[PDB]
């Protein structure tokens, strides 16, 4: 992913927010 003008924790909540629970 790309976190440009963001952090990590937040960034993930946009790109790594692929939960199928």
Swiss-Prot record:
Site for Endothelin-receptor binding site, residues: 21
Disulfide bonds: 1-15, 3-11
Function noted in UniProt: Vasoconstrictor activity. Causes cardiac arrest probably as a result of coronary vasospasm. Displays high agonistic activities towards endothelin-2 receptor (EDNRB) (displays affinity in the picomolar range) and endothelin-1 receptor (EDNRA) (lower affinities).
Protein name in the entry: Sarafotoxin-B
Shown residues within the full chain: 430 to 450 of 543
């Amino acid at each position: 992913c790309s976190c440009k003008d963001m952090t990590d924790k937040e960034c993930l909540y946009f790109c790594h927010q692929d939960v199928i629970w």
